[PDB]
Amino acid sequence: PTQLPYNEKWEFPRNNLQFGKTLGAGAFGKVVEATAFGLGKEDAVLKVAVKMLKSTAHADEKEALMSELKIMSHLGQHENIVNLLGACTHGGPVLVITEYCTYGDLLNFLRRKAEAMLGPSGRPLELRDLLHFSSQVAQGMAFLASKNCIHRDVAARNVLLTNGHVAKIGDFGLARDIMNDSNYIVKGNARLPVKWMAPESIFDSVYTVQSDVWSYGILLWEIFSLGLNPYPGILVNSKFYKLVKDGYQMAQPAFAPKNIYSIMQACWALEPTHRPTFQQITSFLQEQA
Numbered sequence: 001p002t003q004l005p006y007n008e009k010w011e012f013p014r015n016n017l018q019f020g021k022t023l024g025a026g027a028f029g030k031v032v033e034a035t036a037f038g039l040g041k042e043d044a045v046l047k048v049a050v051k052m053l054k055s056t057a058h059a060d061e062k063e064a065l066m067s068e069l070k071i072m073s074h075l076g077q078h079e080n081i082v083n084l085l086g087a088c089t090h091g092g093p094v095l096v097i098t099e100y101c102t103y104g105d106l107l108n109f110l111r112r113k114a115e116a117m118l119g120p121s122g123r124p125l126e127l128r129d130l131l132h133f134s135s136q137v138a139q140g141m142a143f144l145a146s147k148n149c150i151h152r153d154v155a156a157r158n159v160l161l162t163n164g165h166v167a168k169i170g171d172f173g174l175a176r177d178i179m180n181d182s183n184y185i186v187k188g189n190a191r192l193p194v195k196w197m198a199p200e201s202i203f204d205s206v207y208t209v210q211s212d213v214w215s216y217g218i219l220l221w222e223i224f225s226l227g228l229n230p231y232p233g234i235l236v237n238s239k240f241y242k243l244v245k246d247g248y249q250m251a252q253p254a255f256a257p258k259n260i261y262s263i264m265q266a267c268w269a270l271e272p273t274h275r276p277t278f279q280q281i282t283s284f285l286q287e288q289a
């Protein structure tokens with residue numbers, strides 16, 4: 001968990017990085033765009049996303065970034081996650097070099113796309129596009145699940161779009177301003193994305209792959225509503241916790257076929273083991289796309 005080894009195959013020279021604009025910034029971290037020179041086997045020169053701490057960060061934050069790095073090394077690579085390209089551990093602050101995704105997170109892309117289509121009164125989205133997006137994050141999640149890996153924050157804001165509009169699951173983490181983010185509710189000590197959480201996660205503080213499958217259900221909802229907020233208009237309070245515990249589910253989104261909303265409902269099984277596996281979801285979605 002903390003005792004994994006950082007392999008130095010990933011080690012990259014920070015002086016071979018030319019930084020661009022900041023892509024996102026949290027309290028104690030940020031993601032900045034950069035150009036790396038001689039990166040990888042083929043000595044590629046490409047645009048990367050670099051994840052780093054700010055000056056405000058302390059040893060606590062340093063440890064987390066390192067651990068995250070150790071995990072990304074452990075996991076392996078898959079087309080539908082945000083891959084680790086390299087890391088700078090020596091001679092300065094820890095820098096994490098990952099794939100750069102031209103279109104940013106899925107949530108804004110969906111929201112800004114929808115506005116463009118409404119406009120008249122790139123090209124517009126069609127139902128195939130949402131199926132593909134949904135499909136791809138399933139392949140990605142299914143990859144983690146094969147590694148006994150738990151994301152604990154599945155949502156459209158942490159799903160990124162590269163060229164060709166290929167979806168990759170990531171985690172902004174320190175690079176997200178969750179202190180002022182209303183999608184993150186203050187429960188006790190922690191700030192949690194409550195509306196995406198399985199009931200067992202909220203109450204028993206239990207996180208499994210199946211709790212991630214629940215969160216994926218919420219994700220499908222975001223996609224087929226073109227970026228609406230989950231449980232819209234509903235304040236997170238005692239009533240809201242009771243409702244979820246008693247099997248309250250959102251209504252069908254405007255753009256979901258009934259079989260897609262059916263799969264949303266299966267993700268929201270109150271019993272964790274009754275929810276689908278990510279592979280099940282993948283093969284079904286692949287077929288629809």
Ligand SMILES: COc1cnc2[nH]cc(Cc3ccc(NCc4ccc(C(F)(F)F)cc4)nc3)c2c1
Nearest residue numbers: 023049051081082098099100101104169170171172
């Ligand atoms: C905004 O415009 C962009 C453009 N390209 C981009 N590439 C990566 C990000 C944001 C980002 C940067 C790094 C990162 N890494 C954290 C992480 C943790 C865990 C995984 C995992 F588990 F899915 F493998 C992936 C990524 N996750 C997300 C980005 C933002």
